[PDB]
Paper text:
In this paper, we report the crystal structure of the SARS-CoV 2′-O-MTase nsp16 in complex with its activator, the zinc finger protein nsp10, at 2.0 Å resolution, in conjunction with mutagenesis experiments, binding and activity assays. Nsp16 was well defined by its electron density except for two flexible loops (residues 19–35 and 135–137) with high B factors and weak or missing electron density. Electron density corresponding to one molecule of S-adenosylhomocysteine (SAH), the co-product of the methylation reaction, was identified in the putative SAM-binding site. Neither SAM nor SAH was added to the purification or crystallization buffers, therefore it must have been captured from the medium by nsp16 during bacterial growth. Binding specificity for SAM/SAH is achieved by holding distal SAM/SAH carboxylic and amino groups through five hydrogen bonds (G81, N43, Y47, G71, and D130). The ribose moiety is held by three hydrogen bonds involving Y132, G73, and D99. The nucleobase occupies a loose hydrophobic pocket engaging two hydrogen bonds of moderate strength with side chain and main chain atoms of conserved residues D114 and C115, respectively. A peak of electron density presumably corresponding to Mg2+ is localized onto nsp16, distant from the SAH-binding cavity. The Mg2+ coordination mode is through six first-shell water molecules in an octahedral geometry. Binding via water molecules, involves T58 and S188 side chain hydroxyls and the main chain carbonyl of E276.
Numbering used by the authors:
A (entry chain A): 1 to 135, 139 to 290
B (entry chain B): 10 to 131
Write the structure that this text describes.
Amino acid sequence: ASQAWQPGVAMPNLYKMQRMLLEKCDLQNYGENAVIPKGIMMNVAKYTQLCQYLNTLTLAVPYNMRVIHFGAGSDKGVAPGTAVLRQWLPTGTLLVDSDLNDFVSDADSTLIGDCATVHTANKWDLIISDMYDPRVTKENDSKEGFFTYLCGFIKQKLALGGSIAVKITEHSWNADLYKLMGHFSWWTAFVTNVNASSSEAFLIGANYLGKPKEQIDGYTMHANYIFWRNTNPIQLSSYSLFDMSKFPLKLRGTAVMSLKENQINDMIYSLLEKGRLIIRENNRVVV
Amino acid sequence: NSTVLSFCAFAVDPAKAYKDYLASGGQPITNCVKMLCTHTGTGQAITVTPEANMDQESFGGASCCLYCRCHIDHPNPKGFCDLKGKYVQIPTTCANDPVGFTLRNTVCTVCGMWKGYGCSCD
Ligand SMILES: Nc1ncnc2c1ncn2[C@@H]1O[C@H](CSCC[C@H](N)C(=O)O)[C@@H](O)[C@H]1O
Ligand SMILES: [Cl-]
Ligand SMILES: [Cl-]
Ligand SMILES: [Mg+2]
Ligand code: NA
Ligand code: NA
Ligand SMILES: [Zn+2]
Ligand SMILES: [Zn+2]
């Protein structure tokens, strides 16, 4: 299949435009995965397909890129996702990761503890989150916890032009996060081909604008997401994992400028929208 | 990793402890992070990105380091680790025990390959 070759499947605009009622999801998140190649961890495969998908988007890639990775630790005590990010990102990109529990990492810095304790003055070019809480005994409402911190972190600490990829599932999601997706030049819900039988997806926001481009209702969009997953079964595929020749993120040398609010006009928003500009300071990073 | 890590962490000589543990029939440390790669790399031992050739696997460095995995001091002069933040290439025949491989082997200082494996020097 043509779809089988892709690193995964993005939620079609047709489904984003709906106003669906919230239903239960007909998918299970755990299963014996027949597509993961031998000796490869699910999360290496998953993050590899995520990065392959991010390669198709207009990500800003400054010369001195700043990337922060939340929920980077596993119960294995290692950081498979971080290792993939380090493989993907330009050499000497600042990569900081974080998790509630202790783990060993290939990141430049590793912060242990609840994400809410993570403080930094500096802004970031890319935010990746794999945060998830097993914890849904009754209703499926918008979840707070780390999502509340994440929305604040994006609003305060993501550079204009920056991008995000945040893991969600049927039950692990947040209405304000979805709303915030409308503050990006483009957004989608992306399902990796290696984990396609799960309700997991990454909410990807490309090129942050710091203001609404469209009005997203979070409860409605999650219902739209569930409806799409319920009505479009995706067969597991690891096809994309067998050609790694073009994997690393392209070195774009994206301009970084510190501009005042009043300097950010029409032509600047246009550059931001096209993945051609990052707006933030270039001070020393302290996390 | 279930016993092996503590066993070595609470030994006077953690590397010797791992060897003894293996000699007694214990399973090598698991969950070393194997990368997806082209297998058309330089074949050097420790690199900035995955550089496996056709005879090697590439692993995330920190996950293949005994001292990182046991959360103990490195024996290096200060506290520096040669593996963490980098990728280590390991002969496919030896890929079952990446931590053991790095403990038992040494990188040639001229060609940058593993002595007794990829290194062909005089
Ligand atoms: N409130 C919170 N703060 C920080 N980390 C959290 C959190 N809630 C969940 N997490 C983390 O989210 C992770 C889900 S598993 C993440 C897998 C990891 N990305 C990998 O590559 O293997 C767990 O490690 C858990 O510690
Ligand atoms: Cl790619
Ligand atoms: Cl330009
Ligand atoms: Mg565009
Ligand atoms: Na970007
Ligand atoms: Na509503
Ligand atoms: Zn180490
Ligand atoms: Zn040599």
